[PDB]
Structures are given as C-alpha cells and as structure tokens.
From a paper:
In this study, we determined the crystal structures of E. coli (S)-ureidoglycolate dehydrogenase AllD, which forms oxalurate in the presence of NAD+.
In the monomer, AllD has 10 α-helices and 13 β-strands, which fold into three distinct domains. Domain II is the central folding unit, with seven β-strands (β2–β3–β4–β12–β5–β8–β9 in order) and four α-helices (α4, α5, α7, and α8). Overall, Domains I and III, which protrude from Domain II and face each other, are localized on opposite sides of the central β-sheet in Domain II, and these domain orientations generate the inter-domain interface on the top of the central β-sheet surrounded by Domains I and III. First, conformational differences were investigated between two subunits of AllD in the apo form. This analysis resulted in a root-mean-square deviation (rmsd) of 0.45 Å for 315 corresponding Cα atoms, and these differences were evenly distributed throughout the structure, indicating that the structure of subunit A and B are essentially identical. The apo structure differed from both the binary and ternary complex by rmsd values of 0.54 Å for 337 Cα atoms. Although the rmsd values between the apo form and the two complexes were not significant, large differences are localized only in Domain III. Structural homology searches using the program DALI with subunit A of AllD in its apo form as a search model indicated nine structures in this family, with Z scores of 36–54 and rmsd values of 0.7–2.7 Å for Cα atoms.
Numbering used by the authors:
A (entry chain A): 1 to 337
B (entry chain B): 3 to 317
C-alpha cells in the first residue's frame, strides 16, 4: 500500500482519539509514527497503532496525565510524565531541553514514567532544527542477553544523534544496540523463514536459525552493544530512579498498567563552544565528503550516516509513504482491537 | 614491578625528555593505569614514542593552559597541544567541579596530544561520585561502511558510573573491530588475520596484514555513525580539524596533534537519590555477573569487570 503523509496522520490521530486520547496528544503520537514510516522505520510506524489503541482504552497509557516539569539546575530537569503516551512526554521534554540549551548552552532532561516513545530520532531532529546537537536514548522491553549470557536483562535500548548542517540539512544517526529488532523474529515466525544465526539465541543462549526457537536477542558487536545498552539503561533508568534492566515492563505484561519507562535527552548549543555557522558548514562538508568516498566493490555508493533514511523520507514527500496493507484496513474502521 | 615504581620511572624519563615533573607524573599515571587493565595498546609500550615527541617539541612542554568557561555547565580547556593525559585530566577536574556545583558539565579539550586510555578520565568522575562520559578524535584509519577510502579514526568512547563504596562500573569501546596495533603485531608475528578486521586499498576485506590499508568500523554502519558522532562532538563542536583532516601519529613528530576530546559529567543528585543510584549500580553489577552463561563462556561479566579484576591482580 501507499498513502501520503497527511492522510496517514489523520487516520492515526483518529483511531487514537477514538481509543480515548486527547486530540493534540493523538496528533503528536501520530506525528512521531508517520515520521518513522516516512524514514523506513516501519517497526515504529503505523503498525503499532492497534497495540497503542488497546492500551489507551484499558488505561495502560494515561489519557489525562498530570505532567510536572521539575527543573533541578540551570541545565537539568525531569519531566514527570504520569505515564502519558511516550511520543508526547518525550517531545515535551525535548522542547524544554531546547529552550534550556538555548539560554544556558547545555541541557540534560530525563523523561520519567512514560509509554513507548517510538522512533527516538524524531526527538533529536527536533534539537537539530533548532540549530542544536541532540542526543537521545531510552529503556526498552527486556529481550536481550548480556554478552556471553543466556538470560534476558536489557532491552533493545536505542540511541539517536542529530546535528545541523547548512540550511535545512541535518545529519541524523540512530541505532539499536541489538543485531536485529524483535519484530523481524515474529515476522520470520509468520513465514517459516529461517533466520540468520547472528540475530538471536534460544533459552540456553545458543544462537539459532529457528525463529520459533528464539528466546532472546543478541547485542550488536558482542560486549560493545552490551555495554551500550547498559549505559542507556543507567542514563535513562537508574539515573531517573526508575525500574532498571530486568525490572523494565514488557510490552504485553499488563495493558491496564503504565509502562513506567525512562528516556534521557542531551542537547548541546554549538554557539557555546565555537562558531555555529562554521559548525554547520563543517557538518555539510562531512556529509558531502563521505558521500564522495570511493565505494568498495559491491556497493553502489557510500552513505553518510542516516542518509539512506533521509533519501527515503524525501522520496516519501513526493511519492507517498509505503505501508503494509492491513494496517490501512484497520485504520479506517470503527474497531480498536 | 610495583605501581609507584613504573610511575617514578616514567615520571623520571619523561621529565628528562622535556616535561615538567608534574606533567611527567600524570602521563606516567595514565600509562600505568592502562597496563594494569591489560590495555597494552596504550600502556608503557608507548613511553619512547612519547619521549621522542616531547623532546622534538611535537608535544608542548610549556603549554599556555586556558580554561574558558562558556556557560554554567560548559567550558573549553585550550590545551596548547600539551600531553593529552595532562589536558584530558585537567578538563575532567573542571568538569567534576562543575557538575558538583551545577549538576551537569560538558567540557571540551581543545588541541592536545594523544590522551591514552580514556577510560581513565571517566573513572575520575566516578571516583568523585558522578557519571562520566568521554570520547575523542583519532588518527584517520577507518573506511566508512561500504567505503574504500579512509575518513575517521578508531575514535573511542568511555563511560563510568559509581557503585556503593568503591565499586565503579567502567565501559569503553573502540568504534572499530580491531586496533592498528594488532595489524602491525600480525606482521611481526607473520600471521594471517581474521577477515573482519580490515580491508585492502580497494576496500576488500583481507586476511593478509601486509595488504591492510584501512580498518573496518564495528558492526558496519553502526560503529561508522558512532565514530562520526564522536568526531562531531569532540572535533567539529570545538572548531578543530575533523574527519580526514585529523592528524596522524607518525606524520610529524615536531607538530602538535591538535586533537579534541569531549567530557560529559552528570551529578545523579540532580536527577534522583545518589544513594539509590549507587545501590542500583551495585545491584546491576551483581545481577549481571550472576546471569547464567551461554555455553562457551565461564561467566557473564558486567561491562569492564575483567579489566577491573586485572588491575587488582596486576597490582
């Protein structure tokens, strides 16, 4: 299937407002989801709306959250999110991060107790359009073995980064700290496809090619992805006084209960270090020079990080967002779950 | 051979090579730290390279340090191409001081030599009760994912956080699969190398270390984005040479390296209870080490644990 950005937004906003979210909250949630789809990050796209709807109606996601922005220092704050939708809480936090970095050069803001926030690179792009460097990270559903391990501990804790170049240019990098996303496993379950042995592991911690055998995911680059997801958990969970590692709520544990997730934003105003105009020129030069690199045999081109997603996002404004078929059929009707 | 022994030795040699005693001790300290943890890539195998560079003026023996505070939580240490160990340590001290008072600190080290095992600097912060993050630019040596030309270096990243009592969690990683000192190592071994480490002039993975032109990024585009990020944060942000422009170790022992490093320090009290934080950090380390190992493994380590142990028993 294929529809435009604006229609898909409308549909998602409708389905979510119908579940019981306020109008503007559903708009924000929708905004973050279509962003993901437009960039080809479909696991954080419209596919999640049905799940979101059920949790909203059962009161797992708060539809009347009492936000409280606690400012703890000149460059630090916690947004107590009262288990609001994650897309909403995270963006609000980023907006406070932005104005703080604007005034005082740097900002570190935790988002305390929120639902799933979607593709977190949305929030760092926010910092970048304001002319700042953005870094963001959050906890996730426990699904990954430690390096050398056979029991679940951390989630697929994502990390994203963005910085501005000249004009509208933005360099956006995001990464999962696992080899692959859980959805790719359920999709090969939904195929009787057999998966690569580098993705995942059975209940004994032995890597497997049987998606039905899969109990947990492997961390990217062994101990490295392991350390990175540890760091993200410490920074967006332990730092905020939230449940951590093993303790983090799983997706389908209790649809009537808040996730209590944590997210951390870090924003840096380049003006507080050197010329922001030269910074932006150097970002734009980086992107050009990397894209001009002689590709290895096999490769058509070298991308600068996130470039392929930027290209997809741009091809999407012209041609429309690609979307797996039935999600569309769900979106129009009157049924939530 | 004791710890105060190599230190006093290296302190001596480097002070002979040109450095202030205060500077020689600090460089010694950091080289001493690294060997203990089995980070031989940065241990005292490097004293003579350093000594040469010091004597030849390619490291500033009389740096005009300038700490410019740019905001309540930001600063640049203008390092005048001083030894990186000295510069990085100094900026960390200011970053710790700043986080302690205002809760957060982002401090750039502008124009310094190689700083060594950068995990040393985040441990400083953790010892002070804070979270520490550090990262820096490196000698260009790595192809971009899909690339046949060099752009970024093995730009490392480090992170430490305090536990209960004297426990510290310390994690560091190179953004490449392997370091250059296993490639030159494999030529003196004369020994084939895994095809995961490096490529030839055409960017084709190679088993022949004499045919290595460039290293590969860890996890392809992921380590690639990470070394980019580190370059932007520790170089572009500071208005320093970046990417391909970054200087190499061996180009010119008379020339300042002009590297950058970035420190980020966070005071847990500005977010939650430090007591609970440290308790939970210690819990994490315990729980992870107690996880059932996968076959092939004798244990699960919390990140850095094996090095933490080495610098107990090497002492």
């Amino acid at each position: 299937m294929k529809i435009s950005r604006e229609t898909l937004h409308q549909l998602i906003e409708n389905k979510l407002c119908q579940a019981g979210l306020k109008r503007e909250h559903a708009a924000t949630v929708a905004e973050v989801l279509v962003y993901a789809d437009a960039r080809g990050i479909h696991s954080h796209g419209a596919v999640r709306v049905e799940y979101y709807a059920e949790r909203i109606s059962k009161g797992g996601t708060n539809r009347e959250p009492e936000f409280r922005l606690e400012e703890t220092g000149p460059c630090s704050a916690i947004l107590h999110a009262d288990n609001a939708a994650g897309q909403v809480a995270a963006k609000m936090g980023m907006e406070h991060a932005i104005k703080t970095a604007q005034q005082n050069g740097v900002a570190v803001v935790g988002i305390s107790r929120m639902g799933h926030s979607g593709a977190i690179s949305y929030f760092v792009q926010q910092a970048a359009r304001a002319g700042f460097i953005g870094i963001s990270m959050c906890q996730s559903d426990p699904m990954v073995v430690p390096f050398g391990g056979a029991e679940i501990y951390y989630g697929t804790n994502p990390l994203a980064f963005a910085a501005p170049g000249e004009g509208d240019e933005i360099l956006t990098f995001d990464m999962a700290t696992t080899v692959q996303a859980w959805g790719k496993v359920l999709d090969a379950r939904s195929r009787n496809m057999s998966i690569p042995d580098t993705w995942a592991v059975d209940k004994n911690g032995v890597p497997t090619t049987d998606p039905f055998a899969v109990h947990a995911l492997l961390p990217a680059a062994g101990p490295k992805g392991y350390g990175l997801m540890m760091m993200i958990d410490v920074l967006s969970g332990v730092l905020l006084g939230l449940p951590f590692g093993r303790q983090v709520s799983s997706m389908y544990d209790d649809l009537h209960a808040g996730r209590n997730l944590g997210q951390l934003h870090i924003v840096i105003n380049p003006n507080f270090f050197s010329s922001s105009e030269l910074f932006r020129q150097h970002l734009s030069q980086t992107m050009r020079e990397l894209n001009a690199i002689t590709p290895a045999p096999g490769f058509n081109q070298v991308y600068y990080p996130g470039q392929d997603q930027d290209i997809k996002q741009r091809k999407a404004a012209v041609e429309g967002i690609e979307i797996v078929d039935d999600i569309y059929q769900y979106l129009i009707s009157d049924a939530l779950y």
